[PDB]
Write an enzyme that holds these catalytic residues in place. Sequence first.
Site, PDB file in Angstrom:
ATOM      1  N   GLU A  80     -69.250  41.720  80.787  1.00 10.18           N
ATOM      2  CA  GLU A  80     -68.422  41.511  79.598  1.00 10.18           C
ATOM      3  C   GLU A  80     -68.176  40.040  79.278  1.00 10.18           C
ATOM      4  O   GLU A  80     -67.492  39.324  80.018  1.00 10.18           O
ATOM      5  CB  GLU A  80     -67.072  42.214  79.749  1.00 10.18           C
ATOM      6  CG  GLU A  80     -66.100  41.903  78.599  1.00 10.18           C
ATOM      7  CD  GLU A  80     -64.790  42.696  78.666  1.00 10.18           C
ATOM      8  OE1 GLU A  80     -64.448  43.195  79.764  1.00 10.18           O
ATOM      9  OE2 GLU A  80     -64.101  42.798  77.618  1.00 10.18           O
TER      10      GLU A  80
ATOM     11  N   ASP B 173     -64.791  49.605  96.389  1.00  9.13           N
ATOM     12  CA  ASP B 173     -65.121  50.843  95.688  1.00  9.13           C
ATOM     13  C   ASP B 173     -64.717  50.691  94.227  1.00  9.13           C
ATOM     14  O   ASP B 173     -63.559  50.886  93.893  1.00  9.13           O
ATOM     15  CB  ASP B 173     -64.378  52.023  96.302  1.00  9.13           C
ATOM     16  CG  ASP B 173     -64.935  53.377  95.835  1.00  9.13           C
ATOM     17  OD1 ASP B 173     -65.354  53.489  94.662  1.00  9.13           O
ATOM     18  OD2 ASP B 173     -64.938  54.337  96.645  1.00  9.13           O
TER      19      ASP B 173
HETATM   20  C1  LIG Z   1     -62.894  32.134  75.180  1.00  9.09           C
HETATM   21  C2  LIG Z   1     -61.649  31.324  75.643  1.00  9.09           C
HETATM   22  C3  LIG Z   1     -61.659  31.243  77.203  1.00  9.09           C
HETATM   23  C4  LIG Z   1     -61.780  29.863  75.096  1.00  9.09           C
HETATM   24  O1  LIG Z   1     -60.677  29.010  75.474  1.00  9.09           O
HETATM   25  P1  LIG Z   1     -59.995  28.009  74.419  1.00  9.09           P
HETATM   26  O2  LIG Z   1     -58.619  27.444  75.040  1.00  9.09           O
HETATM   27  O3  LIG Z   1     -59.721  28.789  73.031  1.00  9.09           O
HETATM   28  O4  LIG Z   1     -61.012  26.808  74.154  1.00  9.09           O
HETATM   29  P2  LIG Z   1     -61.159  25.608  75.208  1.00  9.09           P
HETATM   30  O5  LIG Z   1     -62.667  25.034  75.152  1.00  9.09           O
HETATM   31  O6  LIG Z   1     -60.093  24.435  74.887  1.00  9.09           O
HETATM   32  O7  LIG Z   1     -60.855  26.149  76.670  1.00  9.09           O
HETATM   33  C5  LIG Z   1     -61.612  25.650  77.740  1.00  9.09           C
HETATM   34  C6  LIG Z   1     -61.047  26.192  79.042  1.00  9.09           C
HETATM   35  O8  LIG Z   1     -61.122  27.618  79.017  1.00  9.09           O
HETATM   36  C7  LIG Z   1     -62.115  28.062  79.959  1.00  9.09           C
HETATM   37  N1  LIG Z   1     -63.439  28.260  79.290  1.00  9.09           N
HETATM   38  C8  LIG Z   1     -63.840  28.170  77.958  1.00  9.09           C
HETATM   39  N2  LIG Z   1     -65.135  28.402  77.559  1.00  9.09           N
HETATM   40  C9  LIG Z   1     -65.652  28.683  78.818  1.00  9.09           C
HETATM   41  C10 LIG Z   1     -66.999  29.037  79.239  1.00  9.09           C
HETATM   42  N3  LIG Z   1     -67.999  29.150  78.372  1.00  9.09           N
HETATM   43  N4  LIG Z   1     -67.259  29.264  80.523  1.00  9.09           N
HETATM   44  C11 LIG Z   1     -66.313  29.174  81.443  1.00  9.09           C
HETATM   45  N5  LIG Z   1     -65.054  28.869  81.267  1.00  9.09           N
HETATM   46  C12 LIG Z   1     -64.647  28.599  79.879  1.00  9.09           C
HETATM   47  C13 LIG Z   1     -62.180  26.976  81.037  1.00  9.09           C
HETATM   48  O9  LIG Z   1     -61.302  27.187  82.144  1.00  9.09           O
HETATM   49  C14 LIG Z   1     -61.862  25.713  80.241  1.00  9.09           C
HETATM   50  O10 LIG Z   1     -61.109  24.747  80.966  1.00  9.09           O
HETATM   51  P3  LIG Z   1     -61.392  23.195  80.706  1.00  9.09           P
HETATM   52  O11 LIG Z   1     -62.607  22.736  81.666  1.00  9.09           O
HETATM   53  O12 LIG Z   1     -61.828  22.952  79.174  1.00  9.09           O
HETATM   54  O13 LIG Z   1     -60.022  22.390  81.043  1.00  9.09           O
HETATM   55  C15 LIG Z   1     -60.306  31.973  75.084  1.00  9.09           C
HETATM   56  O14 LIG Z   1     -60.370  32.036  73.638  1.00  9.09           O
HETATM   57  C16 LIG Z   1     -59.967  33.377  75.661  1.00  9.09           C
HETATM   58  O15 LIG Z   1     -59.558  33.463  76.842  1.00  9.09           O
HETATM   59  N6  LIG Z   1     -60.143  34.458  74.855  1.00  9.09           N
HETATM   60  C17 LIG Z   1     -59.853  35.846  75.302  1.00  9.09           C
HETATM   61  C18 LIG Z   1     -60.946  36.383  76.264  1.00  9.09           C
HETATM   62  C19 LIG Z   1     -60.669  37.805  76.782  1.00  9.09           C
HETATM   63  O16 LIG Z   1     -59.531  38.081  77.213  1.00  9.09           O
HETATM   64  N7  LIG Z   1     -61.718  38.675  76.740  1.00  9.09           N
HETATM   65  C20 LIG Z   1     -61.883  39.849  77.640  1.00  9.09           C
HETATM   66  C21 LIG Z   1     -60.724  40.883  77.487  1.00  9.09           C
HETATM   67  S1  LIG Z   1     -60.647  41.680  75.816  1.00  9.09           S
HETATM   68  C22 LIG Z   1     -60.613  43.463  76.199  1.00  9.09           C
HETATM   69  O17 LIG Z   1     -61.631  44.183  76.177  1.00  9.09           O
HETATM   70  C23 LIG Z   1     -59.270  44.086  76.601  1.00  9.09           C
HETATM   71  C24 LIG Z   1     -58.362  44.631  75.471  1.00  9.09           C
HETATM   72  C25 LIG Z   1     -57.969  43.514  74.463  1.00  9.09           C
HETATM   73  O18 LIG Z   1     -59.084  45.643  74.764  1.00  9.09           O
HETATM   74  C26 LIG Z   1     -57.124  45.278  76.161  1.00  9.09           C
HETATM   75  C27 LIG Z   1     -55.805  45.343  75.386  1.00  9.09           C
HETATM   76  O19 LIG Z   1     -55.070  44.389  75.246  1.00  9.09           O
HETATM   77  O20 LIG Z   1     -55.556  46.588  74.872  1.00  9.09           O
END
Ligand SMILES: CC(C)(COP(=O)([O-])OP(=O)([O-])OC[C@H]1O[C@@H](n2cnc3c(N)ncnc32)[C@H](O)[C@@H]1OP(=O)([O-])[O-])[C@@H](O)C(=O)NCCC(=O)NCCSC(=O)C[C@@](C)(O)CC(=O)[O-]
Lengths: 413, 407, 405, 405
Positions: free
Chosen positions: B100, B308
């Site tokens: 994911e 598991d």
């Molecule tokens: C996408 C982010 C992380 C961007 O994060 P950001 O703060 O918008 O942008 P950023 O570039 O300023 O952030 C960078 C930092 O975030 C991390 N980061 C950033 N990009 C990367 C990358 N490529 N690879 C690895 N780590 C990354 C990393 O730790 C990095 O630290 P830094 O070195 O800059 O100080 C943020 O917008 C986010 O966390 N979004 C949400 C993601 C998420 O939660 N998705 C999965 C769950 S959704 C689901 O299916 C569940 C749900 C919703 O249905 C359940 C419910 O609530 O009912």
Amino acid sequence: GNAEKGAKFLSDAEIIQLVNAKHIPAYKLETLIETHERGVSIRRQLLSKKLSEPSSLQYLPYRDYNYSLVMGACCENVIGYMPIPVGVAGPLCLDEKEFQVPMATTEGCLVASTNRGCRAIGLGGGASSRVLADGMTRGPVVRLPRACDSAEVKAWLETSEGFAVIKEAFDSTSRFARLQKLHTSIAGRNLYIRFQSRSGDAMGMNMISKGTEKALSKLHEYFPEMQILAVSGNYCTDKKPAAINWIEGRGKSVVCEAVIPAKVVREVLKTTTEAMIEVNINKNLVGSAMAGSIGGYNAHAANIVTAIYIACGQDAAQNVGSSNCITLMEASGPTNEDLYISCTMPSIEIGTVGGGTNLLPQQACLQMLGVQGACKDNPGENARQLARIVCGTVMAGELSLMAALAAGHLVKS
Amino acid sequence: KFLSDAEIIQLVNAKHIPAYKLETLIETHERGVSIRRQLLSKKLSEPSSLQYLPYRDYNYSLVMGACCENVIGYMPIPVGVAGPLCLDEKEFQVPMATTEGCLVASTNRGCRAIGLGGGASSRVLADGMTRGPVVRLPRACDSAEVKAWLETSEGFAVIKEAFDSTSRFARLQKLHTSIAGRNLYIRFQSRSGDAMGMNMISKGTEKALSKLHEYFPEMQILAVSGNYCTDKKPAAINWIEGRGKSVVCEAVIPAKVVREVLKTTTEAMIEVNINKNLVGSAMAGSIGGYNAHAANIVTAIYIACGQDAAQNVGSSNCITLMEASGPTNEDLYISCTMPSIEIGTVGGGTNLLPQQACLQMLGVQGACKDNPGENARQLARIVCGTVMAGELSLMAALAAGHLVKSH
Amino acid sequence: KFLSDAEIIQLVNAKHIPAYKLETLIETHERGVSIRRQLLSKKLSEPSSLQYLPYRDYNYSLVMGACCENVIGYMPIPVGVAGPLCLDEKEFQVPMATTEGCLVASTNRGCRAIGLGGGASSRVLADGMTRGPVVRLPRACDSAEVKAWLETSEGFAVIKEAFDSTSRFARLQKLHTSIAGRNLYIRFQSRSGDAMGMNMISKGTEKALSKLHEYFPEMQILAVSGNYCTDKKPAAINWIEGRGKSVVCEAVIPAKVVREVLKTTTEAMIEVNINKNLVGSAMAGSIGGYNAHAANIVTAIYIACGQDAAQNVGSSNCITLMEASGPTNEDLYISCTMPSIEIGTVGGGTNLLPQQACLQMLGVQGACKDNPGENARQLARIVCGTVMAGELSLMAALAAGHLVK
Amino acid sequence: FLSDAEIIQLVNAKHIPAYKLETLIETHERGVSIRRQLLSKKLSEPSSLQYLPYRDYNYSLVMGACCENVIGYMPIPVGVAGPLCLDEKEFQVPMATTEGCLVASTNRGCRAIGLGGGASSRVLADGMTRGPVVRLPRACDSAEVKAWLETSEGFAVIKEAFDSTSRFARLQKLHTSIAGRNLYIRFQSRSGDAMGMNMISKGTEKALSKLHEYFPEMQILAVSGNYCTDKKPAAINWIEGRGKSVVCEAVIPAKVVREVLKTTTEAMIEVNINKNLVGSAMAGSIGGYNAHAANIVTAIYIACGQDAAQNVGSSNCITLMEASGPTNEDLYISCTMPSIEIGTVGGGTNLLPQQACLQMLGVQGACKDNPGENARQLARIVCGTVMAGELSLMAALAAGHLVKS
Ligand SMILES: CC(C)(COP(=O)([O-])OP(=O)([O-])OC[C@H]1O[C@@H](n2cnc3c(N)ncnc32)[C@H](O)[C@@H]1OP(=O)([O-])[O-])[C@@H](O)C(=O)NCCC(=O)NCCSC(=O)C[C@@](C)(O)CC(=O)[O-]
Ligand SMILES: CC(C)(COP(=O)([O-])OP(=O)([O-])OC[C@H]1O[C@@H](n2cnc3c(N)ncnc32)[C@H](O)[C@@H]1OP(=O)([O-])[O-])[C@@H](O)C(=O)NCCC(=O)NCCSC(=O)C[C@@](C)(O)CC(=O)[O-]
Ligand SMILES: CC(C)(COP(=O)([O-])OP(=O)([O-])OC[C@H]1O[C@@H](n2cnc3c(N)ncnc32)[C@H](O)[C@@H]1OP(=O)([O-])[O-])[C@@H](O)C(=O)NCCC(=O)NCCSC(=O)C[C@@](C)(O)CC(=O)[O-]
Ligand SMILES: CC(C)(COP(=O)([O-])OP(=O)([O-])OC[C@H]1O[C@@H](n2cnc3c(N)ncnc32)[C@H](O)[C@@H]1OP(=O)([O-])[O-])[C@@H](O)C(=O)NCCC(=O)NCCSC(=O)C[C@@](C)(O)CC(=O)[O-]
């Protein structure tokens, strides 16, 4: 030897340097570098020294794995891949067809048991299944100044015209977005709106979010004073136990049944229909009720869902709601020596397109069941078919484990 | 022995030797899987479906006879890493086997907020795997008697003796009984070193049920597992009584870090946590799921570390709470309580080498010689810690209006 | 004092007196009520709507300052009787205060099947009222520490001593703790003689929480009741852990009796019990309600015997099971397990005389001098017994196709 | 007619069922007077009903309608709380109870609301339900029926049948649920000012017949397969609603919180969250995110002739509290109750004393002009009064005022 500054290819040696230089953050390696695999190599290197036991990574595969398909939408910080044994169970004689079910697992006997269960079904005339409903959901939390306002919005969303404008907005989101019902729920000035729509052969969690968002906007145009607190206010519900998924359904709801001949129960399953039934009731019904279960009136539906899910590229975390299942067993036949068994699963969140479904090895297990990709002629058919197989295989597993428990075979195996 | 490949094929066919027999019949694990794939292909509507399912040169020596049957290959799950996770004054590089997108990215972003926040603290509140068989008696009055017996100190002692004599680590804690007419559900609870213990416990309750039978010969042992454990099914009892390892977690993110890293407000986070993870979950009729996506984090770590993945069901139970904190109440106080983390560092998929790699990566791998159970417990804390991290990031994204931006 | 309802009302209308105090002034209860009705009629859109609300000649003596505030009369609830209930080799004439037709008739018909079935047997499995306050600490690590402390034998001993020093019957049993971040929910469990004990326990947990504070001065006592008891709200914890008195019940109805009295088949009963009380309840997402109408029976007996009719919520928890039994499996084996019967034979509405009448009718009234708690326990068993009776009859009716008509 | 000791012997001999006594004696009261004597022998203490009332009650309205084997009636103290400033009106709420402070507390709560500009309420939905269990030979068959019931024409023939049952029977949606070859059908319909449990049963029965005509192989196992759900805890009532669903809110001025309620808005909120939300969740509650909604429902229910046993589902309620106002010192409070099973006609609503409490609220009987209005209005009052009680008790808990009152 050693050098300094961006240039041509460079060497692992100091490309690392520019990462410390804080201009090439770890996770961006594929952004810069030319070959995905190098990227993973460099990260395993960086990560390597960040480690207390740097020699760990040694037995963590990673070499030669199509990463062009993971980087981008399936994982971040790739430091390799994890090998999960894949067994096969079957044939599963379901709806006059036979399936060779792939199960990615690490638990001994699971495949053997599911097989033994498939066997009983095959020698029983096979099994029948029906998809009762289909629709992925998303339930955001929205707020209004007063409860009286929430109330008004609720009533609006319930008028036919109100629903029509919301539906139009929602459906204009995708080719497959076709908003079904709308379940609303009030908590003071809070309003939880459950959006339900089909989504072809996609699990649709993404499509639906895009749809509810566009819909919430159009909704806002009418109630400007409304605060959209979160697209997901846990009323979907996604990846968390919830009576609403059990009662209202989520994803694909499906029934399953088969009748095992008394002979087959004694021979293959090693017990009695009478014993099976005596155990199913007091275990899957009375027991589950005693433990305060909501949705878990089954022996180990989870074991079967997870295995198939991992093997076929589904979201293994949805294992939570997808495993909801009530398994029932009755005496049947001219002498009531035959075992009638059914399994109802109201919330199978599954898809045949997108996600891990885009990776080739997972796709292999999908083709193995002839479900892979979108069903061009009849959209949603593959997703639905796979759902039925999941329900079918679960009944199989239920059959075998229940038997083993009845016979007192669990500790042996 | 040598026999042409297809010679084994036909041979098996003409004998109807069950494919699963292969591993014993043939010499060398990879032959039997290669042959099985071959038999299977001819039963498929597209004999070349397994064209992309790996299987070659894998270590099946461990798998067969211990983890999977009818092996036809293996499934590659991308493994990302998140961290460091500054937990209990240590840093962990958490491996997450997932498919994911953003999950790893998000968990990372969450770990970051925690690191720049002074780190996180965790405590294992309880430890004990359970097994609850259903047992029957002629009359409810009899069940009643047994219940009372099991509750006397001597009665418990003879049951404990029998139970503990089962293993080196089997040390029966309490005993929770529950009556349903003439039915009696007995919940056995015991520690189990660094093993998840599902197996050890079954052996123990079985031996105990025998000794119990000696005293109540009229008692019917209907099933070692009467769903009162409860294993792999949603159950209020796991949530209330706990199962496996119960653990708390907390951290305080500096208001600056919330605005900078998480891209929102402590005020906004809290406003969302309450109405989503509390009021929302309650509206959906949840039992145990007062969290955003604890499951995403458990599964990933579970798959990566040989746990598991199906126990993802009860292990994901978690209530995440967020309060305003600090001199100005602009700092974010966050906690995550997970009552039923079923985990282990020995046995199961924990015996495979690649999974073991991810365990060493967290320095938890194998049994903890000096202090038995320590690795299991430590890993549990990491799972809880990483969950808080993920909770932090996703909650933030939701507050900020970022799910359909990131994804 | 003695003036005139005509003017004792003016002072009052001079707001020099709040209606809910007439008592303190006008010493002669009925008059106090009387004046208050008059003063209220005026405030009503239909000044004489209280025309038919009784109030005269009731012994407000005991009610005032212990069961009701702003009294303006009393409400008459028809009281029927069902039985005998052949339970544990005894016969009880069960009083049921209700307003629902057939409930008494049905419970009776159910008692009948049981009498001609050799009677019923019951057992009290556990006894303990609970109270679960929410307490707070600076950090979760702190909550954690307190939890562990409360779990050490000495820690529990000092808490128990404090708790028990609260009353003559306060004897703290176990202690169930539960952490939610820096929050700590402590479930206190203690017997309480023949009293339902909700009050006794609050007094005990409070004194205990103080002694607990002495050790963790940084602990905030947020509320003596943090809904972890749980009182008057549906809760899996009452179902699983039990609350009040937990009791089992059983009887075997002879196939003949099922066909003759209950008008059906053991086979039909069983087919219905499973698909209704088990599969159905599960489909509706029930926690604790695997029964037909245990509530109808609890409420009726509760109102008739001075119990807290609102505890009807948790007290009704009940799973009713039915199996085939006998040499031919034509006999009906039935059991009913109720884990959380909150009941008492002393205090509360138990102090009023008419309610006490229904208690004596069952020979449970007041405290059991010789064996403390016995009356409460005995009544609990009767409640469970009568519930089985009602379960039997209604289930039958449903099987036979009789609810409507 | 003549004599007493004679009717007895005559009875004892020809051994007449005590319950038939009404059909052999000129006046009802002499029936229950004989019944009572007749039962006294059968007691360990013949003089038990001594203080149990019975004379001059008017069993006429009870006989063959509200209760069987009547041996008298039970007096429940009736207090009054208010005015309840709800939706720009004031109500004097009657509460039949036996628990001290309940009325006092509900009053204190009403007070805070009055000095707060009053409260607002909305009925979100209205519909009583009935969910029978029906069976088919195979699950594939159940499946087919489910799909049929879901087609517009199929629903139309079912609705026609259902509605032809009564003048108020107007079948709303239809929620079906499959469990293998079992099919649970939840029928939902309005019912004027009647609670409608009876009307609906008659309607689903008629509908199940018409349904049978189409699927002759269908077995109607029970008109009630616990999928309604009636008088048992069930997530479906909480999520889908049952009866009347209603919201309530009010904003108490910071001054009023400190003065009347004796605390702080900040303290209230800190308690509501950790008690009614975090606590309830810790206890595994489904539907009970409130302090004591039950206390209020039961009291009003007993006073106004409702089914006190429905106290079970009717009490479902989530109470929420936020900081509000220019300084966030004001208390915003809401109470959402999804399943208030209530009615203003029939049942105990036919008795005169209960009718008194109904008039007192101006809800009594059917609402001629706008059918259902009284039932709905009463529902809103129940929700309003619940908020009031929630307000006061929550406060008391925050302030540490419980044990002592
Ligand atoms: C996408 C982010 C992380 C961007 O994060 P950001 O703060 O918008 O942008 P950023 O570039 O300023 O952030 C960078 C930092 O975030 C991390 N980061 C950033 N990009 C990367 C990358 N490529 N690879 C690895 N780590 C990354 C990393 O730790 C990095 O630290 P830094 O070195 O800059 O100080 C943020 O917008 C986010 O966390 N979004 C949400 C993601 C998420 O939660 N998705 C999965 C769950 S959704 C689901 O299916 C569940 C749900 C919703 O249905 C359940 C419910 O609530 O009912
Ligand atoms: C072990 C078995 C299958 C033996 O079953 P058996 O009948 O004793 O062995 P058999 O050789 O006499 O029967 C042969 C048949 O078994 C199957 N079979 C046999 N061996 C294999 C094999 N190696 N590979 C593949 N298939 C196998 C196969 O289909 C074969 O058919 P045939 O070859 O004649 O056409 C049975 O005893 C069983 O199913 N045991 C229980 C398995 C189980 O429960 N699995 C999940 C793990 S349990 C858990 O952790 C969850 C739990 C228990 O906690 C949940 C709860 O609380 O209830
Ligand atoms: C109506 C009956 C009792 C007839 O009972 P019957 O067997 O059809 O007729 P009978 O006169 O031959 O039976 C006589 C026996 O029943 C009793 N009995 C009979 N009449 C009386 C009476 N007047 N007063 C007192 N006791 C009576 C009495 O014990 C007597 O024994 P006998 O004197 O012959 O030795 C039966 O058909 C029945 O039980 N009906 C259903 C009762 C019931 O369960 N209703 C209340 C719950 S309905 C509800 O609101 C909740 C629900 C159901 O919706 C919840 C759910 O399932 O979701
Ligand atoms: C005792 C009070 C009312 C005093 O209230 P107070 O503010 O401490 O003292 P006060 O005399 O200054 O207050 C006077 C006001 O209170 C009311 N009031 C005052 N006395 C009366 C009376 N006799 N009759 C009628 N109304 C009265 C009345 O409205 C009046 O307003 P005013 O006329 O001054 O403008 C307050 O401390 C209180 O409400 N206590 C708590 C009551 C309560 O909620 N108890 C029942 C629930 S306990 C239970 O069993 C359920 C539980 C605990 O388990 C639920 C859970 O688990 O959370």
